[PDB]
Design a binder for this molecule. Structure first.
Ligand SMILES: [Zn+2]
Length: 88
C-alpha cells in the first residue's frame, strides 16, 4: 500500500508554486501569469493566436488541437469556500 513512500512536506514545497513565484520576480523566467512562446512538448513556435485565445497556453497549434479534444468541457466539482474575487 502506497502510504508514506515518497509524499513528504519537505519535498512537496519544491512542487509548490512558491518556487516558480520566487523565480518569476527573481529573474523574470516565468511569464506574467500568461502564455509562453515555446511549446512544452516539442519546443515548437507558439503563435500569438493561441496566446490571446488561451490565457496561459503551453502547446503549439499542433500539440494544442489534439488536447483541445481531451478538454472535458465540465468540472462536476464541489469546492465549498469563499474568496476575494472582486474589484475593491
Ligand atoms: Zn508542440
Amino acid at each position: 500500500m502506497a502510504s508514506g513512500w515518497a509524499n513528504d512536506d519537505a519535498v512537496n514545497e519544491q512542487i509548490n508554486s512558491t518556487i516558480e513565484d520566487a523565480i518569476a520576480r527573481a529573474r523574470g523566467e516565468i511569464p506574467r501569469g500568461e502564455s509562453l512562446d515555446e511549446c512544452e512538448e516539442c519546443g515548437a513556435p507558439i503563435p500569438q493566436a493561441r496566446r490571446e485565445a488561451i490565457p496561459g497556453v503551453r502547446l503549439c497549434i499542433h500539440c494544442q488541437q489534439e488536447k483541445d479534444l481531451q478538454k472535458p468541457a465540465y468540472t462536476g466539482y464541489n469546492r465549498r469556500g469563499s474568496k476575494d474575487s472582486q474589484l475593491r
